[PDB]
Paper text:
However, natural resistance can exist in gram-negative bacteria, mainly through the enzyme Fosfomycin-resistance protein A (FosA), that catalyzes the Mn2+ and K+-dependent glutathione mediated inactivation of Fosfomycin. Therefore, increased interest exists to identify inhibitors of FosA to enable the use of Fosfomycin to also treat resistant strains24.
For comparison, the same screen was conducted with conventional single crystal data collection at cryogenic temperatures (100 K) from loop-mounted crystals at beamline P11 at PETRA III. In contrast, 31 fragments are observed binding in the cryo screens, but only 6 of these bind to the more interesting sites 1-4.
Numbering used by the authors:
A (entry chain A), B (entry chain B): 1 to 137
């Protein structure tokens, strides 16, 4: 059957600024870069950046809620978020509707998130503060 | 420091067909559902389906190359691809790279992939046959 995300591929309009964002600003590990892409890792995540002439720099009001959240510890969360803010990284959401999260945009407007906590922890939190109509299986 | 992918959230136009697709067709585990979304798991992947009236059912020619690949073993790949074909799931690309890949669309046009092979396998193949402009770190 299916087991896990094998990789996340993000289309990017300008390869070098996107590599710099994920590697320098977010601290991911850069493994390889070529004329039309790059491979990075973030823990066990394989991230591919793919140069795509069709990728548009998209304001967050023009895209849907699809987004990619990266894990960070409770001890590191606030200083990492504050560093992104001080660096001028654009945001897209403020209301913490799914726990301790910071919502920010990549250079092309991909919707990203820093989040503290696992699915199990979110389910436990939701039992006390459930989403409207929530059922647990 | 970021330690991995925390969750993938897909905006969906209709929650019921999206739950059927990810849970019943793709075999992911449904943990919770509420009026406007659902939480599933696929191995270590935490998947959130978020009901979003801004989600358009998007033909593949009208979206960029951003896509989400799920891991499957080589032994299971062909029968899973056949299952998707029997279900009438559209393909958006043919495989021309190393490692088996099946490129298929979700009900809203999210670009998905089944892939066999890790980042390490891809890097080993690339070292033997580097892409144009390829540099390793
Ligand atoms: C022309 C040029 O400067 N290319 C270049 C710069 C930095 C990196 C990391 C790479 Cl692979 C290539
Ligand atoms: Mn999220
Ligand atoms: Mn892929």
């Amino acid at each position: 059957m299916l087991s896990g995300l094998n990789h996340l591929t993000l289309a990017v309009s300008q390869l070098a600024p996107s590599v710099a964002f994920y590697q320098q600003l977010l601290g991911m590990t850069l493994h390889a870069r070529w004329d039309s892409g790059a491979y990075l890792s973030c823990g066990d995540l394989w991230l591919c950046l793919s140069l795509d002439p069709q990728r548009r720099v998209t304001p967050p009001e023009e895209s849907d809620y699809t987004h990619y959240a990266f894990s960070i510890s409770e001890a590191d969360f606030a200083s990492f978020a504050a560093r992104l803010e001080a660096a001028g990284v654009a945001v897209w959401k403020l209301n913490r509707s799914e726990g301790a999260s910071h919502y920010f945009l990549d250079p092309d407007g991909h919707k990203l998130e820093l989040h503290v906590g696992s699915l199990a922890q979110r389910l436990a939190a939701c039992r006390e503060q459930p989403y409207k109509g929530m059922v647990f299986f």
